[PDB]
Amino acid sequence: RVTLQEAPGTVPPGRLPRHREVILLADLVDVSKPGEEVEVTGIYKNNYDGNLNAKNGFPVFATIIEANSIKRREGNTANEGEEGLDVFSWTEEEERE
């Protein structure tokens, strides 16, 4: 599990970022690295919490994101030529070419 903030390039200027929690199951372990901007496709879910209810005094629930796909987006902002989780991967026909 990992903490996900907002990208400074998309936050409104002079404001504060928002944090969420991301859960990585098997085959997704150590794919992400600290300091690396990423894009995660996942499922949004909610669960109960006690201390969170105690501090706010209202029936509030915590939210987490379980990852289903991860795409690195560090440096290479050009993301229109082709689609996919990775743009540096080749098929057999591309190797033949």
């Binding site: 002079g14 504060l16 005094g57 209202f58 509030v60 629930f61």
Partner: protein, 502 residues
């Protein structure tokens, strides 16, 4: 027990909802403003309704308006029932069963924070202050559905309170709810929730005393509507919140002087004392501080004035004359400012190379020849513009800076004037006395339209798409006609090439 008073106020409420029948203008014989509002909710799938207090005021005088305003919490469900009744009388398909919300606005008066007193609990009120902090938009349980585990019966529509409440009985005769219930997440209905903090303005507060603080809770469509630092007016109902920690919970459990108004003697409290604190609930927030898309905003003046301006023959000759009428002379400076404000096209190559599409202008002159007036006018006219001095007192300076708490895990950046001026005009004054860090960051921010930093384990590339306008003073005070721009100014040669006009 039938609370007939609630039924009576609900009947009057639905009556003036259905047949208000006010007239706005001469051509507006009968408007039926709330019927038109319901039509709007039909055609756009909205859920909230807005009611003016003044329009409510003259209906039955104080027999209805005061009856609703004073005991707002007492009669809220009756108003909800009446609204649901009229909506399902006039638009059943709108219900496809949904949380209707009502927001009252245009109250006669607004109260200060220091005038908040306990006798107004449950009464409609309006307050104002400076918002200083917000919170994340967390989901909130509103109507829970439960399953009796040993018999798998369904008990739903369980209204909640300031604690997470489970049912108390199982309708199945053979079962007697000895076991507890399992919450059905996919059957429950959640609602938005955000808590903001407000304090007294600098105007009201006397002497050197500390400001008074209050906590406001938003709900529904009014989330993220009060950004920090903005002075806003809130409309809602006074409430009181106890300490849930003393209350029974599944989880485990100035101030040291005590003397709080503790209350004890209940079943669930045991030997614990219950305290209370004042909090405000809000329902209405306001703040007091493509060419075809534009053509879609159609009006008689929109067509006529724009067509006349387009079809004229001496627009330009007039246009420059209309910029900064206060200043005297300086025609070319006005034309240059107009050209800057129009701006240039922005294009990108096929391989991802960006081309700068902005105009940068510098103004040089001897002291007191009305150079700051243009800066002030363009700040007051051009949207999303920021006025800034050349020497900045903050650590952000011009571009950005990194700040971290002492032994604190913040490692966050703070935005400089160039960062705030995104998609706008930055107006720096007194360009001469900039320092080396800014003096070398600017000619990267200008040409490449981006700012990059890598310090103490955090790296980022911030967007700084700005159109800069600057002013300066020649070395020695007065411009020496004998020499040239390079001789008089102390700016570096690469900076001069950055600018487009002088």
């Amino acid at each position: 027990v039938d609370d007939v008073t609630g039924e009576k106020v609900r009947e009057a409420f639905e009556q003036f909802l259905e047949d208000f029948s006010v007239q706005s203008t001469d051509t507006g014989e009968v408007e039926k403003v709330y019927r038109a509002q319901i039509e709007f909710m039909k055609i756009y799938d909205l859920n909230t309704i807005y009611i003016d207090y003044q329009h409510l005021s003259m209906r039955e005088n104080g027999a209805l308006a005061m009856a609703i305003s004073e005991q707002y919490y007492r009669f809220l469900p009756f108003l909800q029932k009446g609204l649901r009744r009229v909506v399902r009388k006039y638009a059943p398909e709108l219900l496809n069963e949904r949380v209707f919300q009502i927001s009252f606005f245009n109250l006669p008066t607004v109260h200060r924070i220091r005038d908040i007193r306990s006798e107004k609990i449950g009464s409609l009120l309006s307050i104002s202050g400076t918002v200083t902090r917000t919170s994340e938009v967390r989901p909130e349980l509103y109507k829970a559905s439960f399953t009796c585990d040993m018999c798998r019966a369904i008990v739903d529509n369980v209204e909640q309170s300031f604690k997470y409440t489970e049912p108390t009985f199982c309708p199945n005769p053979s079962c007697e709810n000895r076991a507890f219930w399992t919450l059905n997440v996919t059957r429950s209905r959640f609602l938005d929730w955000q808590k903001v903090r407000i304090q007294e303005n600098a105007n009201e507060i006397p002497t050197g005393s500390m400001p008074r603080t209050l906590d406001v809770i938003l709900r529904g469509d009014s989330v993220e509507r009060a950004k920090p630092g903005d002075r806003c007016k809130f409309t809602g109902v006074e409430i009181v919140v106890p300490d849930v920690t003393q209350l029974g919970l599944p989880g485990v459990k100035k101030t040291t002087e005590g003397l709080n108004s503790g209350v004890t003697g209940l079943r669930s409290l045991g030997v614990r004392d219950l305290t209370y604190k004042i909090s405000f609930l809000a329902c209405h927030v306001i703040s007091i501080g493509d060419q075809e898309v534009f053509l879609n905003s159609l009006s008689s003046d929109e067509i006529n004035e724009l067509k006349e301006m387009v079809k004229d023959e001496h627009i330009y000759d007039k246009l420059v004359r209309s910029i900064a009428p206060a200043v005297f002379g300086h025609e070319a400076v006005k034309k240059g400012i107009l050209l800057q404000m129009l701006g240039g096209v922005h294009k990108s190559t096929v391989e991802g190379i960006k081309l700068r599409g902005d105009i940068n202008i510098c103004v040089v002159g001897d002291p007191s020849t009305s150079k700051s007036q243009f800066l002030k006018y363009v700040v007051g006219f051009a949207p999303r513009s920021v006025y800034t001095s050349g020497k900045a007192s903050s650590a952000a300076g011009l571009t950005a800076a990194v700040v971290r708490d002492e032994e604190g895990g913040d490692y966050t950046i703070e935005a400089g004037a160039l960062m705030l001026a995104d998609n706008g005009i930055c107006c720096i004054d007194e360009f001469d006395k900039m320092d080396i860090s800014d003096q070398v960051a600017i000619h990267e921010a200008m040409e490449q339209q981006t700012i990059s930093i890598a310090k103490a384990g955090i790296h980022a590339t911030l967007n700084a798409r700005t159109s800069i306008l600057a002013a300066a003073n020649p070395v020695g005070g007065r411009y020496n006609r004998k020499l040239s721009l390079r001789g008089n100014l102390n700016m570096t040669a690469p900076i001069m090439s950055r600018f487009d006009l002088f």
